[PDB]
């Protein structure tokens, strides 16, 4: 994220890869992640939402409000992050996913995913699109709480 006030320095930076604790090694494997579709391709914003209260420690009361950014990979996996430019970066911006697509699909819903669109409705409707010309209509719903 860049500011037009400060157009050479990012206001915020979000890494999309799980790559903690293995440091001090160089850059080359960018050929092989792409063959598996492990490249982020596209993103879109849903409407302004109140953040799930489990994502903060049990200190707060004010309901924090942020934009849900939906992010698509070249393999057709989808991820979520909650982005605010009005609040401190305590847990705000954590990546959430991969988001499970129901029902399950025996092709795995393609591997040539190229575009995404998040419609301004409740619940959200996320359109996912492929280079093969397939368009999937994903309704977004909050997950289930498991009994013991």
């Amino acid at each position: 994220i860049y500011s037009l006030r400060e157009p050479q320095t990012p206001t915020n930076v979000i890494i999309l890869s799980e790559a903690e604790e293995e440091s001090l090694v160089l850059n080359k494997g960018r050929a092989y992640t792409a063959s598996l579709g492990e490249t982020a391709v596209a993103f879109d914003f849903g409407p302004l939402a109140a953040v799930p209260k489990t994502l903060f420690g049990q200190n707060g009361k004010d309901e924090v409000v942020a934009y849900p950014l939906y992010i698509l990979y070249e393999n057709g996996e989808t991820f979520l992050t909650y982005i605010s430019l009005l609040h401190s970066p305590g847990n705000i911006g954590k990546l959430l996913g991969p988001l499970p697509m129901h029902p399950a699909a025996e092709d795995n819903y393609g591997y040539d995913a190229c575009a995404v669109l998040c419609l301004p409705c409740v619940p959200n409707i996320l359109v996912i699109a492929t280079e093969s010309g397939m368009l999937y209509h994903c309704v977004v719903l909050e997950g289930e709480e498991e009994d013991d």
């Binding site: 420690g57 049990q58 200190n59 009361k61 970066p89 305590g90």
Partner: protein
Amino acid sequence: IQQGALELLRSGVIVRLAQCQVYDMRPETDPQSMFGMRDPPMFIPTPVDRYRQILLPALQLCQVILTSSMAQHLQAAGQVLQFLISHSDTIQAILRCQDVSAGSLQELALLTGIISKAALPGILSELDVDVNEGSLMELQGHIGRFQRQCLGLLSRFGGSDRLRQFKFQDDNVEGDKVSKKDEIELAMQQICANVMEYCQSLMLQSSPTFQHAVCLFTPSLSETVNRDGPRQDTQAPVVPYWRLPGLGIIIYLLKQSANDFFSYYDSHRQSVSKLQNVEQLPPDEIKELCQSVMPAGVDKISTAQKYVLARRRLVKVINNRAKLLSLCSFIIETCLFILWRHLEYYLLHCMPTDSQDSLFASRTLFKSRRLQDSFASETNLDFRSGLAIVSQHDLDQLQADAINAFGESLQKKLLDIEGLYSKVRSRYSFIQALVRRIRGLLRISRN
């Protein structure tokens, strides 16, 4: 000047302060900036300290109007309460502010010392003007947000994490610790004093009859019992500031101020001895005392100028430590008053909720009836329905833990303090009188 405060309330100064939008323009203090550089002391203050140079004079003016305009001008408290409500989410942002800088503690120390005088119940019954029920319910809804957030400061600063907050500062920045530590210790004890002033004034206004006293602290003393065991830093779930504190915080704060007092007494006495012998101090102590007033250039000024700066630091330390002794004295006496009134309620006037004969007193009003007609009865919104369900086990446990937690090694220290300090006030034996009454209640077995 009392006349000047009245003439400022007639010119409408608080109504003008309640029109200024600069107080809500609070700069965002980014926590990630702590890894960015070592900037020199620039001739232009930070946006946050410019915001403090704007806000702190307004809070001090409001606080001073509430301290020259003595207890006959409910209009002064009502105007300052309206100013706390125009800026109400900024006032809540200060009361939530997790920073422990000398500035955030001065913001909190002034604000609590305004709320202690402006957020009092009788002010709502004597503001006789055409205020719509909705705006009076929102006014109560703001007071009932400030009250709960101020009670949440007693667990933060009058509780066991004050002894974490100092460590996180004592580790990080060597060259400037001493100068600011006097002011952080002072402002923490002002926050504790002003919330205890508020709790006392509420427990004096809320009923002339002892049977109807407003309890502010739950009968839980467990906050005083659970610490003789070293175990690892699992995050303590920080206590939702909708929850009322335990009475254990009052006994812990009473135990803490009855240790801090002796430390501040010998610190004051050592500082007075250093002020009497300044020209016999080591040149390096004279240099530290000077550096705490002039962070640069001390090796260019004269020996007379160094002794004058050392004398000026020592006077500020003496007066800060005298201020601290007077605050620890107030917190001790007001802890004993609040502890007396809560034990007097819970042991004599409180009925346990396990008493089954109550079963006929509830089932008829929450069923839908529409439209009219006509007027004339009091819609008292019963706040008592937010009290905890007190079992007889909470009352047995309260009496057992209160006997242990108020044991004779504390009762002696409180009389040792009265024998040192209260020879300088018109009210010798007040600590003995409350220590006698609490020792009385704790000998009444319920039968």
